[PDB]
Each structure stands twice: as structure tokens, then as C-alpha cells.
Design a protein around this ligand. Structure first.
Ligand SMILES: *[C@@H]1O[C@H](CO)[C@@H](O[C@@H]2O[C@H](CO)[C@@H](O[C@@H]3O[C@H](CO)[C@@H](O[C@@H]4O[C@H](CO)[C@@H](O)[C@H](O)[C@H]4NC(C)=O)[C@H](O)[C@H]3NC(C)=O)[C@H](O)[C@H]2NC(C)=O)[C@H](O)[C@H]1NC(C)=O
Ligand SMILES: *[C@@H]1O[C@H](CO)[C@@H](O[C@@H]2O[C@H](CO)[C@@H](O[C@@H]3O[C@H](CO)[C@@H](O)[C@H](O)[C@H]3NC(C)=O)[C@H](O)[C@H]2NC(C)=O)[C@H](O)[C@H]1NC(C)=O
Ligand SMILES: CC(C)[C@H](C)[C@@H](O)[C@H](O)[C@@H](C)[C@H]1CC[C@H]2[C@@H]3COC(=O)[C@H]4C[C@H](O)[C@H](O)C[C@]4(C)[C@H]3CC[C@]12C
Ligand SMILES: *[C@@H]1O[C@H](CO)[C@@H](O[C@@H]2O[C@H](CO)[C@@H](O)[C@H](O)[C@H]2NC(C)=O)[C@H](O)[C@H]1NC(C)=O
Ligand SMILES: *[C@@H]1O[C@H](CO)[C@@H](O[C@@H]2O[C@H](CO)[C@@H](O)[C@H](O)[C@H]2NC(C)=O)[C@H](O)[C@H]1NC(C)=O
Ligand SMILES: *[C@@H]1O[C@H](CO)[C@@H](O[C@@H]2O[C@H](CO)[C@@H](O)[C@H](O)[C@H]2NC(C)=O)[C@H](O)[C@H]1NC(C)=O
Ligand SMILES: *[C@@H]1O[C@H](CO)[C@@H](O)[C@H](O)[C@H]1NC(C)=O
Ligand SMILES: *[C@@H]1O[C@H](CO)[C@@H](O)[C@H](O)[C@H]1NC(C)=O
Ligand SMILES: *[C@@H]1O[C@H](CO)[C@@H](O)[C@H](O)[C@H]1NC(C)=O
Length: 745
């Protein structure tokens, strides 16, 4: 191991990097031990770590230069843009750990057999690459000295790949992870007598449960995200050291089988098809449970008192079943260290007991959404000065009375969701002292009064959802201090005044929904300063003046990352009812049941049986996008449509119906290639429909009726596919589907 070879090898590797900007301090002028990413012991290189650097070289360059360094013990190249395939090479006997995860390695997984020349190799990570397995699986990986092997998240599809991995022996193996592939067939680790960690999740297993044999060392077993059913209980009967069992997202059925494995600390049976009331399936002492998840099955009945033995439980998840009865305090109060209580989507009922306040001392998350609780929200929920509560989810129940202003004592609160209840009174101003609050959701209640100026103190505020209350007054200027606002929804209240000019300062603002209020004045040009605005719904107000060209100036520069990943529903207007306005309502929908959407019937004249679209927000671009949804219908807008309207390639819906807009449809409307819905009806538009609109190919709905348009309807494009109704009440308009233009009228 001469310095001469060491330095020439390191530098010869640097000299083949495409980006000259890489490894700026490696030099034949410096000692290797001074290089960034190099670790030495007694002035000799022992480890190299170039992970998260865009090397952009082939594995052969890596194996030629770095893996043959005498005395090298570890090599970390995770997320280094290494591509190509591994093949035979000379490897130093000192090398114990190789991390090649998160690259673009490709070829048959049989290529990894070449690593057999690393005689000391004990740890191999090749997760997140594109390795695969031909057709028929034969021979074996033959790396039987590995203690740790991670082949996760590759492109391995095939039956019995696991046997292939283990074929030449697995006496040394402690940790095997191969999740995130498409492997099927048998898993037999019965000869892996030292195996402590097995992860075969997110694969394609649909037959036998893994055979574990003696199961003498196993502590962690994850078979989640497959299509397994059958007798998992019998398969782990011998497992005396098991601490974590994850069988969630599979096809298991029947009642919960006994699992009195006393060592068990984490257990998930979530998203299967288990049925019944909970039988006592644990030891007298609740095994050693810190974590329990029974979510997404068909359980019903009361939460059994034997759960009172789980005094170490930190996380209890029972959501999306059919549990009933009143909150089980006697049981829950025995869980002195409970951090997460998730009972959402069940049929718990009755009022909140005062003892619930004893529980909220360790509680980070209290989730009671979508049940049948009633009575008032507890006033003293956060009495204790050492309270840690971060999430309070009470939405979609039957709570009455006021929002307790003492919720301001929940100083660590991050998300407050009280939507879908029957709360009255005002939004307490003390909420402004929640210095970590990010989400304030109170929609569909009977709240009155004004939106509190004191919200200006919540610099962390990202979501403000207040639709369907009885709020009055104007948008308070204090909101301008909430510079991280992403989603503002104030629709269906009785708010007044203007859209303030400071709205343009809100650079994170993605969704602004103000529909069905009494807002007035002009549309501010400052909306064109909002860097993230993708959804603007202003329908059914009293806005007037002309649509300002500047409001479209951010087109092509829109960012849409922050808004992503949130549950919503979109309720489409079917057009059948005159009282129902706008293209459709986009609404927040975390923890609420669609079945309860009928609760809108007293607020909303729209046929509930109208189409409900749902999911998690997912913009079509990440950056350099444009507005996606613009609805300014049922106002008193006048003047002309600016040509800038056509500058939004991601605009799916444009609704300017029922205003007093005049002049003609701009040719640039034909530039809106993503357009599905164009509603310009009940205005005063004149002139011809531009032929340029023939270029639009994605239209599913158009409406130009009730204007003063004239001349022929364009022959090309989608016009001919729409009913005459979409063009009626335009005296000068002619051509299919209208009567043919006839010069002599
Ligand atoms: C903007 O917001 C305002 C304020 O919310 C909103 O006005 C309200 O609209 C709703 C829906 O039209 C009205 O609903 C009242 O209450 C019920 C709703 O279920 C209805 O009465 C019965 O309804 C049931 C269910 O549909 C039906 O089976 C039954 O036949 C109805 N009873 C009758 C008359 O036979 C009525 O819709 C109505 N009831 C009353 C008070 O007669 C609210 O009354 C409205 N609240 C007001 C005006 O203060 C308005 O629509 C929103 N605007 C837009 C464009 O969305
Ligand atoms: C093989 O390499 C994989 C890719 O690096 C490893 O998978 C990653 O392990 C990371 C370290 O545990 C995880 O770190 C995440 O982000 C931070 C890191 O400091 C943690 O706080 C987070 O808790 C953790 N994840 C989250 C958000 O909870 C990576 O998430 C994880 N996954 C990927 C695909 O990157 C394997 O661990 C490694 N195999 C072995 C056996 O070591
Ligand atoms: C970017 C987010 C804010 C947004 C909620 C996003 O997650 C969501 O997928 C958006 C893009 C969806 C939600 C509802 C969708 C619309 C649902 O309403 C409809 O009228 C359909 C009719 C027809 O299927 C059209 O092809 C699309 C169209 C008109 C959809 C266009 C795309 C959406 C507007
Ligand atoms: C996951 O496994 C299933 C079940 O083995 C695969 O479906 C089979 O695929 C083979 C090969 O094309 C067919 O011959 C069988 O008829 C399929 N069986 C059934 C019941 O449909 C499926 O291909 C696998 N998924 C992936 C992504 O590899
Ligand atoms: C138990 O397994 C489930 C399901 O596989 C885990 O949840 C998934 O985690 C993976 C990443 O490993 C994600 O890709 C999935 O989106 C998750 N699915 C669901 C439905 O949440 C869960 O994390 C595991 N629990 C523990 C403690 O290990
Ligand atoms: C727009 O709504 C407002 C509030 O009712 C009104 O603002 C008037 O605008 C016109 C033209 O700018 C002028 O009469 C005055 O500048 C404003 N006077 C009032 C009443 O405040 C106006 O009625 C509406 N019309 C327009 C086109 O602005
Ligand atoms: C590996 O990356 C380089 C650089 O982009 C490329 O030239 C080469 O073709 C890649 N190899 C494979 C097999 O894709
Ligand atoms: C759910 O449980 C409740 C207990 O109150 C019962 O009345 C109801 O019929 C059950 N619903 C379903 C879908 O099984
Ligand atoms: C909010 O906006 C301005 C600063 O630009 C000022 O009125 C005020 O000090 C800011 N912060 C608070 C807490 O009001």
C-alpha cells in the first residue's frame, strides 16, 4: 500500500470525471488524507465517500481505480450517478462495505456475483438501481459471506428470486432487504440461522407465507404490500426474538389470530380483510407493544378492556373500521405514554370525557375525525403547561358550541381541523398565539364574526380553510404577514370588501377560492405577482371593472411543489340547475367521509349526486407552469378579454360566464392547448369565433350561448361535436350545429 499507488489511483479516477467541477480539491499536489470524501487512519486511506456527487461515470471506472485500493475498508457512492454494469475486477481484501445505492446500475442481477472477488465483503447495498432477473432463475448469487444485503427497489421480476439469493448458503446473513421489486414464489430463510431482519415488502408474493424455520434470531419481519393470505400466525409461532411484525396491505382474512409473542413491540395488521370484534390475541401483559395498527379492516364492537394491559403503547391506530361505543378512557388512561391516538373513520359516539385531558400530556396526535361524537369540544384540553399536542383532528363529527379559546394553550399545535361540525361563535383571536400553527381548517360550521386580525402573528400559517360558514367583514390586512400561505379558501361566507392589493406579496399562494361571497371592486393586477397561483375561483361575487392583462404575467414561471400531496375533493357542477354556479368546488378533504358531503345540501344548491372527483393534489408541472383553473363567472366584469388570457398552457378550465364582457374572443384563446372547459356564455361578446380555436383538441365542454357573436362556427376542430345549445342566442351565428349560414336572412 504505497502512497505512490494510492495517489495515482485517486487522481486517475478524478481525471476521468466528466464534470471538471467535481472533486475540486483532489490533487497530485496534496496528500490523499486531505481530500474531501476521504478518510484515513495513520496516514493511509481507509474509506472513500463520494455519495450525492454527480460523478456520472461507469462502474468499471469505479472498480478500476477505487475498489482496487489496497487497505480500503469502505466505499460509499450512494446517489453518485454511477451507471453501467458490475463485472469482474480485482478487489482489495480489506474492503468490507460497499454502498452503491441510488444509482443507475443495470443488467442481470447475476452481475453481482462478480463482487465475489471482494473476499472481505460483508455489507452490500445496491438498492435503487435497475438490476433485473432474465427469465428462468438458475444457480445462485453466491455471496455467502454477506452479513447485510439490500437489493431493494430494483427491477427484479420473477419467481423464487429469494432462493437464488440464498442458494449457496446464508449462515452469515443478518439483514436481508429486497422490497420494492416484483418477486414472487417462495421465501425460505430457514437455513439463515442468524437472520435478524427480513424485508420482502412491496413485492409480488401471493402464494406461501415465508418459511422461517427455527426463527431463532429474527427480530424484524416485514411482508407488507403483497397479496398474501393464509396462516401467518402459525408461521411465526417459533419466533422467540421477534420485535416488529408488519403484515399490512395484504389479503389476510378472518379474526385476529393469537399473537402472544411476548417480545413483540411493533405490530401492524393494517389494510387487510380481518373481521370481527377484537379477541384477546396478546399475552396477559400485551406482549411488549409500543406500536399497534389495526387500521383498514372490518373490525367492529367496542375497544376491549384487555388493551388496558398495553401500558407501553405509544401509538394506537384503529382507523377505518367500525368500532363503536364511547371513548374508552379507562383503557386509554392506562397507556401513560401514548403519543398517537388515531380512531378516525369509525362510529365512536357520546361526548368527550373530561379525563381525556389527562391523556393529552404525552399526546402528539389526537385524531377523532369521521365519527359520531357530539357535545362541546373540551375547554381544558391543554391545561397542562408541559402539553405537547401537535395535531388536533376533530373534523366530521357532531360537535356543538364554540371553539374553546383555551386551544391557544396548545402551544405546540401544528394542525387544527374542526371542519364538518356544528360549531358557532367566532374564530378565537387567541389562535393567533399558536406560533407553530401551519393548518387552520374550520370549514362547514356555523362560524360568525370576522376573520381575526391576530392571525398575522402566525408566521407559520400555510393553510386557512374557512369555507361554508357565516363569516362577515373583509379580508383582514394582517393576513399579509402570513407570507407562507399556500391555500386560502373563504368561499360560501358573507365576506365583503375587495381583494387586497397585498395579495401579490403571497408568493407561496397556490389556491385562492373566494366564491359565493359579496366581494367587490376590481380584480387586482397584483394577482399577477403571485408566483405560485394555480387555482383562482372568484365566482358569484360583485367584482367589476375590466380583467387586467397583468394578472397573467407569471405565466410560464409558476411553481407548484408546495401544494402537492393534500387530500381534496372536486365537486363538478353538472350544469342542470340555474342556482348552481361555477365550474366546480375544490375543497380540502383530509379525514372527512364523502358520505357526509350530503351535509352541504343546506348551504349549496348543487345536486350532491353530481360528480365528486377526489385524491391528493398533484400539479402537472413542478416549475415554469401556469394557472390551471380560472373561474370569474357570475360577477359584473366588463370591457374586453386581454389577449394575455391565451398565455397559459396548463389552463384546464376557463370560466368567464355571466358577466358583462364585450369586444371579441381573442385569437390567442386558440393557444390554450390544455383547455378542457371554456365557458364564455351570457356576456356581450361580439364578432366571429376565431378559426384559431380549431386548434384546441382537449375540449370536453364549451359554452358561447347568450352573446352577440356572428358569422360561421368554425368547421374544423371540436365545434361540430357540441350541441346547438352551446351556441344559441347569438343572432348572427350560423353553421353546423346551427342552421347553415345563408347570406339572405
Ligand atoms: C351561497 O351561499 C348561500 C348561503 O348558504 C346559499 O344559500 C342557501 O342555499 C341553500 C341551498 O339552496 C338553501 O337551502 C335551504 O335549506 C334546505 C337545504 O336542504 C332546502 O329546503 C329543503 O331541502 C331539501 C334537500 O334539498 C329538499 O328535499 C326539500 O324539498 C327542501 N324543502 C322544501 C322547500 O320543500 C332549501 O334549499 C332551503 N330551505 C329553505 C330555507 O327554504 C338555503 O336556504 C340558502 N340559505 C340562504 C339563502 O340564506 C346560496 O345558494 C349560495 N349560492 C350559490 C350560487 O351556491
Ligand atoms: C441502502 O441504501 C438506501 C438508500 O440510501 C438506504 O435507504 C435509506 O436509508 C436512509 C438512512 O436511514 C433513510 O434516511 C431518511 O432520511 C433521513 C436521513 O437522515 C432520516 O432522518 C429519515 O428518517 C429517513 N427516512 C424518513 C423520511 O423517515 C432513507 O429514507 C432510506 N431510503 C431511501 C430509499 O433513501 C438503506 O437504509 C440502505 N440499506 C441498509 C441495509 O443500510
Ligand atoms: C393541481 C391540483 C390543485 C388539482 C386538485 C389536481 O390534483 C387535480 O388532479 C386537477 C388537475 C383535476 C381535479 C378535478 C379535475 C377535473 C374534473 O372535472 C371535469 O370536468 C373533468 C372533465 C374531463 O374528464 C376533463 O378531461 C378533465 C376535467 C375538467 C378535470 C380536469 C383536471 C382536474 C381539474
Ligand atoms: C405478479 O404475479 C402474478 C401472479 O403470478 C402475475 O400474473 C401472472 O403472470 C404470468 C406471466 O405473464 C401469467 O402467465 C399468468 O397468467 C398471470 N397470473 C394471473 C393469475 O394473472 C403478474 O404478472 C405479476 N406481476 C408482475 C408485475 O410481474
Ligand atoms: C408497515 O408496512 C406498511 C406498508 O408497506 C408501511 O407503509 C408503507 O411504507 C412504504 C415505504 O416503505 C410506502 O411506500 C407506502 O406508501 C406505505 N404504505 C402505507 C399504506 O402507508 C409502514 O411504514 C410499515 N410500518 C412500520 C412501522 O414499519
Ligand atoms: C365598481 O364597484 C365600485 C363599488 O360599488 C364602484 O366604484 C366606482 O367606479 C366608478 C368608475 O371607476 C366610479 O363611479 C367611481 O370611481 C366609483 N364609485 C363608487 C361607487 O365607489 C362602481 O360603482 C363599480 N363600477 C366600476 C366600473 O368601477
Ligand atoms: C452510462 O453513462 C454515460 C454518460 O451519459 C453514457 O454515455 C453511457 O451510454 C451510459 N451507459 C449505459 C449502458 O446507459
Ligand atoms: C357498524 O357498527 C355499528 C355499531 O353501532 C352498527 O350499527 C352498523 O350496522 C355497522 N355498520 C356496518 C357497515 O357494518
Ligand atoms: C406585518 O407587516 C408589516 C411589516 O412589513 C408591519 O405592519 C408589522 O410589523 C408586520 N408584523 C406584524 C407582527 O404585524
Amino acid at each position: 500500500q504505497s502512497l505512490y499507488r494510492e495517489i495515482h489511483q485517486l487522481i486517475s479516477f478524478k481525471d476521468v470525471l466528466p464534470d471538471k467541477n467535481l472533486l475540486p480539491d483532489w490533487s497530485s499536489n496534496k496528500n490523499p488524507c486531505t481530500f474531501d470524501g476521504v478518510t484515513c487512519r495513520d496516514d493511509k486511506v481507509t474509506s472513500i465517500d463520494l455519495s450525492s456527487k454527480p460523478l456520472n461515470v461507469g462502474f468499471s471506472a469505479v472498480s478500476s481505480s477505487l475498489l482496487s485500493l489496497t487497505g480500503l475498508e469502505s466505499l460509499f457512492l450512494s446517489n453518485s450517478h454511477i451507471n453501467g454494469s458490475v463485472s469482474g475486477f480485482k478487489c482489495s481484501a480489506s474492503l468490507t462495505s460497499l454502498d452503491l445505492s441510488r444509482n443507475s446500475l443495470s443488467g442481470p442481477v447475476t452481475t453481482l456475483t462478480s463482487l465475489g472477488s471482494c473476499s472481505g465483503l460483508k455489507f452490500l447495498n445496491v438498492s435503487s438501481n435497475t438490476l433485473d432477473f432474465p427469465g428462468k432463475v438458475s444457480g445462485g448469487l453466491k455471496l455467502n459471506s454477506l452479513e447485510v444485503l439490500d437489493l431493494s427497489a430494483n427491477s427484479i421480476s420473477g419467481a423464487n428470486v429469494v432462493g437464488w439469493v440464498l442458494s449457496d448458503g446464508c449462515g452469515e446473513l443478518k439483514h436481508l432487504a429486497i422490497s420494492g421489486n416484483k418477486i414472487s414464489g417462495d421465501v425460505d430463510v430457514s437455513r439463515c440461522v442468524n437472520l435478524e431482519f427480513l424485508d420482502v415488502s412491496s413485492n409480488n408474493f401471493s402464494t406461501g407465507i415465508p418459511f422461517l424455520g427455527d426463527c431463532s434470531a429474527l427480530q424484524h419481519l416485514d411482508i407488507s404490500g403483497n397479496k398474501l393470505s393464509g396462516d401467518f400466525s402459525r408461521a411465526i409461532s417459533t419466533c422467540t426474538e421477534l420485535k416488529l411484525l408488519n403484515i399490512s396491505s395484504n389479503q389476510f382474512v378472518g379474526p385476529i389470530p393469537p399473537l402472544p409473542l411476548k417480545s413483540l413491540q411493533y405490530l401492524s395488521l393494517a389494510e387487510n380483510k380481518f373481521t370481527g370484534e377484537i379477541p384477546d390475541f396478546l399475552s396477559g401483559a400485551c406482549d411488549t407493544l409500543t406500536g399497534l395498527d389495526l387500521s383498514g379492516n372490518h373490525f367492529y364492537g367496542a375497544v376491549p378492556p384487555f388493551f388496558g394491559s398495553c401500558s407501553l403503547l405509544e401509538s394506537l391506530a384503529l382507523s377505518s373500521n367500525n368500532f363503536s361505543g364511547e371513548l374508552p378512557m379507562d383503557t386509554l388512561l392506562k397507556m401513560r405514554g401514548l403519543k398517537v391516538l388515531d380512531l378516525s373513520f369509525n362510529e365512536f359516539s357520546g361526548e368527550l370525557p373530561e379525563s381525556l385531558t389527562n391523556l393529552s400530556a404525552s399526546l402528539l396526535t389526537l385524531d377523532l375525525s369521521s365519527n359520531n361524537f357530539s357535545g362541546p369540544i373540551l375547554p381544558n384540553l391543554c391545561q397542562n403547561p408541559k402539553n405537547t399536542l401537535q395535531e388536533l383532528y376533530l373534523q366530521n363529527n357532531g360537535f356543538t358550541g364554540k371553539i374553546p379559546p383555551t386551544l391557544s394553550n396548545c402551544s405546540e399545535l401544528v394542525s387544527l381541523h374542526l371542519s364538518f361540525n356544528y360549531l358557532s361563535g367566532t374564530i378565537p383571536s387567541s389562535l393567533g398565539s399558536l406560533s407553530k400553527l401551519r393548518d387552520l381548517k374550520l370549514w362547514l360550521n356555523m362560524l360568525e364574526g370576522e376573520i381575526p386580525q391576530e392571525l398575522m402573528y402566525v408566521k407559520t400559517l400555510e393553510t386557512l380553510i374557512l369555507d361554508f360558514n357565516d363569516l362577515t367583514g373583509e379580508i383582514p390586512s394582517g393576513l399579509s404577514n402570513c407570507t407562507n400561505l399556500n391555500w386560502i379558501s373563504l368561499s360560501n361566507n358573507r365576506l365583503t370588501g375587495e381583494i387586497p392589493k397585498w395579495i401579490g406579496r403571497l408568493e407561496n399562494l397556490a389556491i385562492l377560492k373566494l366564491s359565493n361571497n359579496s366581494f367587490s371592486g376590481n380584480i387586482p393586477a397584483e394577482l399577477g405577482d403571485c408566483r405560485s397561483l394555480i387555482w383562482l375561483d372568484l365566482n358569484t361575487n360583485l367584482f367589476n371593472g375590466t380583467i387586467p392583462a397583468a394578472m397573467f404575467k407569471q405565466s410560464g414561471k409558476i411553481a407548484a411543489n408546495f401544494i402537492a400531496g393534500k387530500r381534496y375533493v372536486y365537486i363538478k357542477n353538472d350544469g342542470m340547475k340555474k342556482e348552481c354556479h361555477g365550474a366546480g368546488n375544490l375543497l380540502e378533504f383530509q379525514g372527512i367521509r364523502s358520505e357526509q358531503l350530503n351535509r352541504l345540501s343546506t348551504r349549496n344548491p348543487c345536486n350532491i349526486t353530481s360528480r365528486v372527483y377526489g385524491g391528493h393534489t398533484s400539479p402537472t408541472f413542478d416549475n415554469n407552469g401556469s394557472m390551471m383553473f380560472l373561474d370569474m363567472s357570475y360577477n359584473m366584469l366588463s370591457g374586453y378579454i386581454p389577449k394575455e388570457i391565451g398565455s397559459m398552457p396548463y389552463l384546464f378550465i376557463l370560466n368567464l360566464g355571466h358577466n358583462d364582457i364585450s369586444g371579441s374572443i381573442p385569437d390567442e384563446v386558440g393557444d390554450l392547448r390544455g383547455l378542457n372547459i371554456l365557458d364564455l356564455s351570457s356576456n356581450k361578446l361580439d364578432g366571429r369565433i376565431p378559426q384559431a380555436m380549431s386548434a384546441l383538441t382537449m375540449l370536453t365542454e364549451i359554452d358561447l350561448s347568450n352573446n352577440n357573436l356572428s358569422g360561421p362556427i368554425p368547421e374544423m376542430g371540436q365545434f361540430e361535436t357540441f350541441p346547438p345549445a352551446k351556441f344559441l342566442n347569438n343572432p348572427g351565428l350560423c353553421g353546423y350545429p346551427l342552421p347553415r349560414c345563408d347570406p339572405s336572412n
